[PDB]
Amino acid sequence: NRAAQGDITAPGGARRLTGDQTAALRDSLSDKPAKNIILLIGDGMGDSEITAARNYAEGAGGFFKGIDALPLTGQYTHYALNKKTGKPDYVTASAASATAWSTGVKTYNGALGVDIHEKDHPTILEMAKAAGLATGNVSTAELQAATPAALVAHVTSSKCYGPSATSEKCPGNALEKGGKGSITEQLLNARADVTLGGGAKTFAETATAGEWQGKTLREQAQARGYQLVSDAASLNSVTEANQQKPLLGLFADGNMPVRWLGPKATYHGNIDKPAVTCTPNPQRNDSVPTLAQMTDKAIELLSKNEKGFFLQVAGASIDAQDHAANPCGQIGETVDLDEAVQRALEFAKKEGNTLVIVTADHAHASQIVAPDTKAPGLTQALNTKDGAVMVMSYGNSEEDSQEHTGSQLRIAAYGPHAANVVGLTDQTDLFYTMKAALGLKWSH
């Protein structure tokens, strides 16, 4: 536990440490191999997003029982490359960054599972599947979006969701042109044991060529022996997920609804509008499973594999709400991810050979600023758990979308080989850290 000791106004009352950490940190360090890996990604969850969400939901002296409970921490760099020059591009897109940790190769903004030469590389999910391990891919967003897709697809443009967009924007990857296919076609080919998220609308599209030509991708999946679940009741009813009966969960047309509702940040919002208190999103049906609910069922099904498993969990709507300059939606998705991190650690502590990693693909726009601030961008005053006002600001874009930032950010880990996230590392080091931990070998 790293919460404040007691009276934050008294000497020592704000301390998060109870004593010396040397002995406990020594015991946290293991050279032994990981049987399983649980990688949790908060999309755009920079140190600012963690602090804003803790300050709001848990109080400044508060503590995330998930996100902040990982003992070994560091900062890692996530710059992408300029496709023409091969030089760094200091602000990565979600796809170039997801490619970096899933393949250990940097790439250009737009690329998914391919380097700057458009050459595809095997992913940590593919290599784990090759070694006989169970594979899980869970996201709160569309399964075709950057984070879940980087594990199962190789396309020259991250916009190549289905056959329609692929033929037009990735002619080289289009199935009817000799290519591996759209992100969804490649996802179905990849055959992860557990795939849960949104992006049901692309499964409505039909294949232009191949073995399941003229049938919807939804129909292709059914014909290929997949289990299709669309709500929390049916997801719960699943008892097995393997290579014979793989599980595909489609819980939204696009992105699954955000858990918290609040207004969008506005120009002088902290001055001109009242302090906001986040409310549960009423449009969200209770039948839509949460990230922790999906994480928990994935963990359950994947741990039946005696050789081990690799699971990736993506709190993708953190980024979406940061883009939308919506502090409530953004904080809500950080809280949603914290619940999933808690499930992962609960499991890891009990199992003993599970490496849990919690990080982000890049930093984002949101900043915590003084309540009195007169900023040129979009702002909002929020009423936190402390009973004090916090002002959040979005001042890096005049367009309707707030943008990613290139700041290095927190990488945290628990379990075997977790020492490899401490100090300064690169997003690509994460790939090799995972590969080594599971004792995987290059395969495609």
- In the region spanning residues 29 to 58, those forming contacts with a copy of itself, defined by CB under 8 A, are 29-31, 46-48, 50-52, 55
Q: Pick out residues in 265-324 that bind Zn ion (CB under 5 A).
A: 296, 319
CB-nearer residue toward Zn ion: 319 or 336: 319
Assess 393 for contact with a copy of itself (CB under 8 A). yes
Q: Are 83 and 76 in contact (CB under 8 A)?
A: no
Q: Are 400 and 49 in contact (CB under 8 A)?
A: no
Q: Are 193 and 298 in contact (CB under 8 A)?
A: no
Q: Minimal CA–CA distance to 403: which of 414, 391, 395?
A: 395
Q: Which stretch binds Zn ion (CB under 5 A): 40-48, 68-76, 197-205, 382-390?
A: 40-48
Assess 20 for contact with a copy of itself (CB under 8 A). yes
Q: How far is CA 3 from CA 15, 55, 60, 287, 357, in A?
A: 8, 12, 9, 33, 21
User: How many angstroms separate the CA atoms of 309 and 341, rounded?
Assistant: 17
User: How many angstroms separate the CA atoms of 154 and 117, rounded?
Assistant: 12
Residue 236 CB, shortest distance to a copy of itself, in Å, is 34
Assess 89 for contact with Zn ion (CB under 5 A). no
Assess 275 for contact with a copy of itself (CB under 8 A). no
Assess 336 for contact with Zn ion (CB under 5 A). no
Interface residue with a copy of itself, options 363, 381, 434, 438 (CB under 8 A): 363
CB-nearer residue toward Zn ion: 62 or 332: 332
Residue 443 CB, shortest distance to a copy of itself, in Å, is 14
Q: Which stretch binds a copy of itself (CB under 8 A): 129-137, 322-330, 335-343, 429-437?
A: 429-437
Assess 352 for contact with a copy of itself (CB under 8 A). no
User: How many angstroms separate the CA atoms of 141 and 233, rounded?
Assistant: 19
- Six-digit token pair at 63? 């503590």
Residue of 48, 94, 139, 182 with catalytic role: 94
94 flagged as catalytic: yes
CB-nearer residue toward a copy of itself: 127 or 301: 127
Q: Pick out residues in 133-192 that bind a copy of itself (CB under 8 A).
A: none
User: How many angstroms separate the CA atoms of 315 and 301, rounded?
Assistant: 20
Q: Minimal CA–CA distance to 268: which of 371, 365, 366, 367?
A: 371
Tell me which residue has tokens 């996230």. Answer: 421
Rounded (10°) angle between helices 94-103 and 427-438: 30
Residues that are catalytic: 94
Residues at the site binding Zn ion, with contacts judged by CB under 5 A: 43, 94, 296, 319, 361
